[PDB]
Design a protein around this ligand. Structure first.
Ligand code: ZN
Ligand code: ZN
Ligand code: ZN
Ligand code: ZN
Ligand code: ZN
Ligand code: ZN
Ligand code: ZN
Lengths: 586, 187, 620, 201
RNA sequence: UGACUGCUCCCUAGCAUGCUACUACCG
RNA sequence: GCGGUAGUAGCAUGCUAGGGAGCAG
């Protein structure tokens, strides 16, 4: 009930009641926020509401203080005193305030119902605590929106890859894939019982989860909305290039995992943070593995953003680094348990930001910056307080599932504070070495966003195919379908024998489900499917609208396949920019 | 107390009236002076009293709310302390013998007086004199409560180590006699 | 009554709390969910939940006061110093606690000696000191519970004595009160174990709001909460060299016992002219009024007083149950029949037979009273009245009825036998008749096991009214103690009051125009309080002059005593007060330059300020 | 509590709140200590501060002596007389006080950072007791400016007489020779443990 | 390490009531 | 000419709250 206000940092006892997160407001700030905005409720050690029996007023500018309680105009005693006066609300530490002038932007942040692009513009354009508050309230409103959904009434199950499941009345079908996790809890007689961490395929219900339970009666599948804890640390800590390498020990020999990893260490050893600006399959994986043994006496942390993207997080660590030096952190969902759980002392911890064993370090690595918000940066900076760290990830990737915005797409400058921090002043690191890839992605993404700092390592045989087909779009439900995909898969496998074992990018997951039901291709997620790409992939049409195709969803999709990248021109794409081979359908 | 809303009017009227008095005018101006100043002071009176009442009321309200906040902080810290104590004392329950004797009960309920008697790992004995000592814990291992215990340490009333070689009949009057014997459950 | 007899066969390790395992967020606990009494049988809790989420504040308070976890997370203990049952040791060391001597006020002693005091052969000498104790004193004093034995009662006579006692307790009102009507004084005292590791009673009375207290109080009408009692040693002046010990009850018991009993306790301590004289003061003519009330209109008056050897270590359990039931009879509208039984069970489990924490170990209390609960003195008064009533009944029923000259008393004895052994239900008319007979021929004044009785003498000689021998026999066969008649007195002259009541003697002096009764203490007690203190409190009188003012207030009536040193005590105190004031003023004017005034300060060394405290006019 | 201010030859119970050694200054002597420089806080048998809960006043020039307590300016029950008034500060020995002719002894040498040559100059232009105050304040400033540097520690050990050494957070390092003996302590989990005497050059 | 009640004395702060006094308004 | 009302000062009375101390069971 006592703390610092979000603007003056002065001691206060007043909580605003019309903001969903109940921030701590300074008395002058409280007056400014209650006058210039329809936020007319204030909370103190006791609520600032009329206590007259039978009365109901919840204003602040309307109440009068009398005796010991608070009263209104209709019940003010002869000894009365208005709470809202002198442009300053009545509360503790009223004489030790300083006020602030950043009230209009704070009002806009509080009043912004998160509708248009300017919402995120001003979310990313403010001072530190306002960034934290905006991120917190954005996650709060999105989790409230997703919890405003029904309960999956289930009473029986057909079999594996089949399910009958019913939502509530007046509630629509929730979003489809693992980006919106389905984790429910049924009841037997008195309490809740375990169901399983799952996700649904289509509407036939195949299971893309990782378990199988005796599912039937009284089952409650829900997208579990979690209470959000308040933030402590800022989104980033301002760096300063050291002169002493404190704690860091370049070994006598050279652990030559990679050649340029020496330079890696050379400039990541002095600044309080860094970032691994990695194009797909371009050293985005094991530079930290080399750092593991070149700096073996340094406490090194590894993390990502989702439990799905732990492939390179967990493989080479056990593959080449010593067995004992690794450590595992997994809540107990289904993920790689290759290292040791329940071990506090170790130098190489591998996990996600979901849950860690609270400790501090001096070296951290952090993956998947593209779908990372300032909330995740703040929580990783709070849980881990290190000396240097790297944010693995590239702006030429996908945004976080910000379904909140509908009008304007969220561009690289609006991913998070760090993702534009390396955009304005330049990246901490810039690689130009593709591990295993022909120069198609080189040409494409170097003309688009890579600025041609990486060039042809593998030859361009021009086996990849792009055609003149356009496609037709039709909406049914929150997922759509494509007749010039139900026919187009067959029309494109007519005689070409090379893309029969390709992977299916899924702008619409229901369309991929229908393709699997009819012809059959593996389902490939869009956002959380980096590093899971095979050697051979089809980029399908699947859409023409502003769902996916402005710039930054295909920058990694062009790199899914290595030699045979069938990226047909679907819609208002970057058609007249390069050279691509084509075959005309009969 | 000097910039009240009625202060300007009262002071200006007083100054004008006293200037008129210093002008040496007739008695009518003096009567008007007296009436105006009397009513001016009368109206200043309540404006000087009600404000002083209100300030003290506000100060009392502030003090009461501050002490309420302090009480809440103290409650939070005592709750944290109690939780810590409970979760710390939880970690010594020996959850295999306790489970073994709980499951033998016909409904899950057992007397509290037989839990340390059948699940404790350490035993402490307090001995008044040597005659009692030689009948209870003579030697290095003894039997009590249908179990076998072996001695681990012996101290005296001053908490100093005592070796069993000097607990004899002749050397008895040279020890702080409230001896405390510590043993462990055997096997 | 039958359970008391039958419980002596079964093993002693099957009595007490019954525990089981519950789960809170997947972790296992051990909590008490019932009790097994020697008298009340098996009792099970009504609201117990095995699986639950994170617990609240009152659940934490309840689980932190249960001895189950403390006993289950401790070492076994076999103690051969005492013969009482032992449970567990909470630490790895045994704590030995000593008692320190007093502090000597040399200036007062020299001043008293320089005025002809403490000469050889004098009738006033010091016999009150601070006695010191060695390490093994607390356990030696706790070992006195071996005098408490299981006692079966004559039920057909107790069921009539309880009716007469209830007739005695009839002019009051009581019931339950809300948490906002509870009055507590001195909230800066201990809260018991284990609550004394975090604060005093203020912390727990502030951290708990009103509906939390109400919910906690309503929780004990369907469940039983066993607690732990801590034993402490006293540091006070006395005349004998044995250690004294009081019991510190837990806060969770006192907090609810107050809400249960405070209305009746406050109603008792506000009535004047009743049998129980708790609340009446002795100043402003109170002593004379009490003495005149107790004399009533008895026909051949004598006075008598007796004594209880080991009153609290030897009182049987059945009489404590009876006292609790008598006190709890005012709840006929606010409580149901199960609520009253559960309140009785909670009281028995908390202050009659529970785990005590002596030194650093847990023991089992066999029985008796734990002096220090919320209802000590009133229960003692009920017990005293019960013993007096059964002594009168035994005196009347054991007389040859063929030699009783009066026929009314013969019919009364016949009806008494019929109502005791030939009637199954209550007969209110005879209860009223016996109560009137007792109040006419046997007058009492009771203050928590201290009593003065004015009785008809010829009736007692003929055997129609209880005597000292009847009290001796009743105590022998119902209290398991022997009452020597060397600690009892008898006074056949009413112009001199009781020989001793509440450690005060009585004298009949002439003040104003009439004659009144005044109390005076033992001079040795006053002088010992003057000369032996705890440091800083004295040995420098100027720092506390208000001690001697109170001590001289207590010692005023000694100036009317025919003996001469007794008045010299009061005069010496007045001269010492004047000397201390002069010392302060001069001693402060000298080094500093502050000048003191003697305005309305000389009242403290003149007798008129003290004479007004014993004259009936009631000031402040 | 009761010490001695000797330049004014005045027993005192007062002392300057913010100064070097909690120096003892009599009523008028504390006054010209608090007007010739800025030392607006004093300490007596009890410290002078408003006693209502939640109130905060460091200054003494506006406190009042109320009902066996002290109250203040911003939160003002003013049924009292001011603490600081009439060339004096309220305390014992308010009458048996002399004062100081040389007003700026403390105001000169107790107001600088105790490192200039003027400190020692005035210390030699002092009396025996005044120069005693000087010498004790030199020892105090020596220790109080020695306790502003780092603590060396060996975290991984090497062969004796050739080890590795990391130090502290941000602080500078003092001179290098064996003048400063590195005799610290070792911590197992909460306690201090036998270490010995060391020296880093 | 300091239990539950009862009574009494001293000091300060607030509230209510009453007595007297000094100005002012009204009839 | 008498009364009413509004502040201000001194004095007395009983409660509530805080602190220090004494006795009794
Ligand atoms: Zn708001
Ligand atoms: Zn503010
Ligand atoms: Zn109202
Ligand atoms: Zn009741
Ligand atoms: Zn100073
Ligand atoms: Zn001085
Ligand atoms: Zn203040």
């Amino acid at each position: 009930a006592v703390g610092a206000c979000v603007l003056c940092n002065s001691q206060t006892s007043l909580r605003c009641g019309a903001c969903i997160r109940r921030p701590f407001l300074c008395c002058k700030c409280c007056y400014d926020h209650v006058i210039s905005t329809s936020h007319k409720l204030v909370l103190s050690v006791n609520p600032y509401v009329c206590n007259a029996p039978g009365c109901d007023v919840t204003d602040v500018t309307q109440l009068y203080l009398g005796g010991m309680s608070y009263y209104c105009k209709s019940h003010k005693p002869p000894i009365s005193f208005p709470l809202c006066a002198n442009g300053q609300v009545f509360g503790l530490y009223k004489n030790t305030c300083v006020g602030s002038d950043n009230v209009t932007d704070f009002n806009a942040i509080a009043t912004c119902d998160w509708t248009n692009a300017g919402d995120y513009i001003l979310a990313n354009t403010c001072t530190e605590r306002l960034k934290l508050f905006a991120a917190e309230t954005l996650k709060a409103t999105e989790e409230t929106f997703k919890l405003s959904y029904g309960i999956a009434t289930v009473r029986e199950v057909l079999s594996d890859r089949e399910l009958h499941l019913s939502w509530e009345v007046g509630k629509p079908r929730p979003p489809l894939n693992r980006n919106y996790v389905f984790t429910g809890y049924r009841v037997t007689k008195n309490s809740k019982v375990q169901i399983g961490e799952y996700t649904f395929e289509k509407g036939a219900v195949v299971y893309r989860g990782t378990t199988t339970y005796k599912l039937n009666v009284g089952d409650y599948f829900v997208l579990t909305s979690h209470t959000v804890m308040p933030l402590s640390a800022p989104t980033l800590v301002p760096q300063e290039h050291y002169v002493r390498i404190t704690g860091l020990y370049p070994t006598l020999n050279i652990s030559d995992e990679f050649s340029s990893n020496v330079a890696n260490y050379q400039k990541v050893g002095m600044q309080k943070y860094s970032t691994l600006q990695g194009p797909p399959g371009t050293g985005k994986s094991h530079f930290a593995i080399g750092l593991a043994l070149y700096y073996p006496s340094a406490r090194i942390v590894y993390t990502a953003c989702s439990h799905a993207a732990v492939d390179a997080l967990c493989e080479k660590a056990l593959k080449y680094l010593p067995i004992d030096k690794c450590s595992r952190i997994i809540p107990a969902v289904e993920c790689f348990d290759k290292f040791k759980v329940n071990s506090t002392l170790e130098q190489y911890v591998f996990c996600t930001v979901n849950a860690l064993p609270e400790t501090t370090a001096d070296i951290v690595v952090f993956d998947e910056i593209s779908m990372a918000t300032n909330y995740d940066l703040s929580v990783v900076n709070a849980r881990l307080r290190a000396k240097h760290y790297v944010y693995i990830g590239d702006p030429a990737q996908l945004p976080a599932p910000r379904t909140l915005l509908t009008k304007g797409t969220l561009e690289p400058e609006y991913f998070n504070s760090v993702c534009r921090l390396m955009k304005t002043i330049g990246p901490d690191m810039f690689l130009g070495t593709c591990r295993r890839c022909p120069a198609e992605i080189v040409d494409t993404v170097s003309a688009l966003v890579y600025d041609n700092k990486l060039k042809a390592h593998k030859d361009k045989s021009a086996q990849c195919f792009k055609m003149f087909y356009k496609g037709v779009i039709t909406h049914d439900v929150s997922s759509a379908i494509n007749r010039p995909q139900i026919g187009v898969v067959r029309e494109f496998l007519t005689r070409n024998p090379a893309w029969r074992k390709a992977v299916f990018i899924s702008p619409y997951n229901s369309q991929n489900a229908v393709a699997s039901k009819i012809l059959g291709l593996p389902t490939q997620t869009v956002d959380s499917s980096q590093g899971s790409e095979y050697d051979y992939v089809i980029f399908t049409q699947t859409t023409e609208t502003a769902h996916s195709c402005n710039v930054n969803r295909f920058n990694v999709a062009i790199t899914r396949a290595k030699v045979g990248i069938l990226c047909i021109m679907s819609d208002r794409d970057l058609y007249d920019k390069l050279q691509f081979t084509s075959l005309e359908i009969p | 107390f000097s910039s009240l809303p009625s202060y300007a009017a009262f002071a200006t009227a007083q100054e004008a009236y006293e200037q008129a008095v210093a002008n040496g005018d007739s008695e009518v101006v003096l009567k008007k002076l007296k009436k105006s100043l009397n009513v001016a002071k009368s109206e200043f009176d309540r404006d000087a009293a009600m404000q002083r009442k209100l300030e003290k009321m506000a100060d009392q309200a502030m003090t009461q709310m501050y002490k309420q906040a302090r009480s809440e902080d103290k409650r939070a810290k005592v709750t944290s302390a109690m939780q810590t104590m409970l979760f710390t004392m939880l970690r010594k329950l020996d959850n295999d013998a306790l489970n073994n004797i709980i499951n033998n009960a016909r409904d899950g309920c057992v007397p509290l007086n037989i839990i340390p008697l059948t699940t404790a790992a350490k035993l402490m004995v307090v001995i008044p004199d040597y005659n009692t000592y030689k009948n209870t814990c003579d030697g290095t291992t003894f039997t009590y409560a249908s179990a076998l215990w072996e001695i681990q340490q012996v101290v005296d009333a001053d908490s100093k180590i005592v070796q069993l070689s000097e607990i004899s009949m002749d050397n008895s009057p040279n020890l702080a006699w409230p001896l405390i014997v510590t043993a462990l459950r055997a096997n | 009554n039958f359970n008391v007899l039958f419980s002596t066969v079964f093993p002693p390790t099957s009595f007490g709390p019954l525990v089981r395992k519950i789960f809170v967020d997947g972790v296992p606990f051990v909590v008490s969910t019932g009790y097994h009494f020697r008298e009340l049988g098996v009792v099970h809790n009504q609201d117990v939940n095995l699986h639950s989420s994170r617990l609240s504040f009152k659940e934490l308070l309840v689980y932190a006061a249960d001895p189950a976890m403390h006993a289950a997370s401790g070492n076994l203990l076999l103690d051969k110093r005492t013969t009482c049952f032992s449970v567990a040791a909470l630490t790895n060391n045994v704590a030995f606690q000593t008692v320190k001597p007093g502090n000597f006020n040399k200036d007062f002693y020299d001043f008293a000696v320089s005025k002809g005091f403490f000469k050889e052969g004098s009738s006033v000498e010091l016999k009150h000191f601070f006695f010191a104790q060695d390490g093994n004193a607390a356990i030696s004093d706790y070992d006195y519970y071996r005098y408490n034995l299981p006692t079966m009662c004559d039920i057909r006579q107790l069921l009539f004595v309880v009716e007469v006692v209830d007739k005695y307790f009839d002019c009051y009102d009581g019931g339950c009160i809300n948490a906002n009507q509870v009055i507590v004084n001195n909230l800066d005292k201990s809260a018991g174990f284990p609550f004394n590791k975090w604060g005093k009673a203020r912390l727990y009375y502030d951290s708990m709001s009103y509906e939390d207290q109400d919910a906690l109080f309503a929780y004990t009408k369907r469940n039983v909460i066993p607690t732990i009692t801590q034993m402490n040693l006293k540091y006070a002046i006395s005349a004998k060299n044995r250690a004294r010990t009081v019991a510190g009850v837990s806060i969770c018991s006192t907090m609810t016992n107050r809400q249960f009993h405070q209305k009746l306790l406050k109603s008792i301590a506000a009535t004047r002219g009743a049998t129980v004289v708790i609340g009446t003061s002795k100043f402003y003519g109170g002593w004379h009024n009490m003495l005149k009330t107790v004399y009533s209109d008895v026909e051949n008056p004598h006075l008598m007083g007796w004594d209880y050897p080991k009153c609290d270590r030897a009182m049987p359990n059945m009489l404590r149950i009876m006292a609790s039931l008598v006190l709890a009879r005012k709840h006929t509208t606010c409580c149901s029949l199960s609520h009253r039984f559960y309140r009785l069970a909670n009281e028995c489990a908390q202050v009659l037979s529970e785990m005590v924490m002596c030194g650093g170990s847990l023991y089992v209390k066999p029985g008796g009273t734990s002096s220090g609960d919320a209802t000590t003195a009133y229960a003692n008064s009920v017990f005293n009245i019960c013993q007096a009533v059964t002594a009168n009944v035994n005196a009347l029923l054991s007389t040859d009825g063929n030699k009783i000259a009066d026929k009314y008393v013969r019919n009364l004895q016949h009806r008494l036998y019929e109502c005791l052994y030939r009637n199954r239900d209550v007969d209110t008319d005879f209860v009223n008749e016996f109560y009137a007979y007792l109040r006419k021929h046997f007058s009492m004044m009771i203050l928590s096991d201290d009593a003065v009785v004015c009785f008809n003498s010829t009736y007692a000689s003929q055997g129609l009214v209880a005597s000292i021998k009847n009290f001796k026999s009743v105590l022998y066969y119902q209290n398991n103690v022997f009452m020597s008649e060397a600690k009892c007195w008898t006074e056949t002259d009413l112009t001199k009051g009781p020989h001793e009541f509440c450690s005060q003697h009585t004298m009949l002096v002439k003040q104003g125009d009439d004659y009144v009764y005044l109390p005076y203490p033992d001079p040795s007690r006053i002088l010992g309080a003057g000369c032996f203190v705890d440091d800083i409190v004295k040995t420098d009188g100027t720092l506390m002059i208000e001690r001697f003012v109170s001590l001289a207030i207590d010692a005023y009536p000694l100036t009317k005593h025919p003996n001469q040193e007794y008045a010299d005590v009061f005069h010496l105190y007045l001269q010492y007060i004047r000397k201390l004031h002069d010392e302060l003023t001069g001693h402060m004017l000298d080094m500093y330059s502050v000048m003191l005034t003697n305005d309305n300060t000389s009242r403290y060394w003149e007798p008129e300020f003290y004479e007004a405290m014993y004259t009936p006019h009631t000031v402040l």
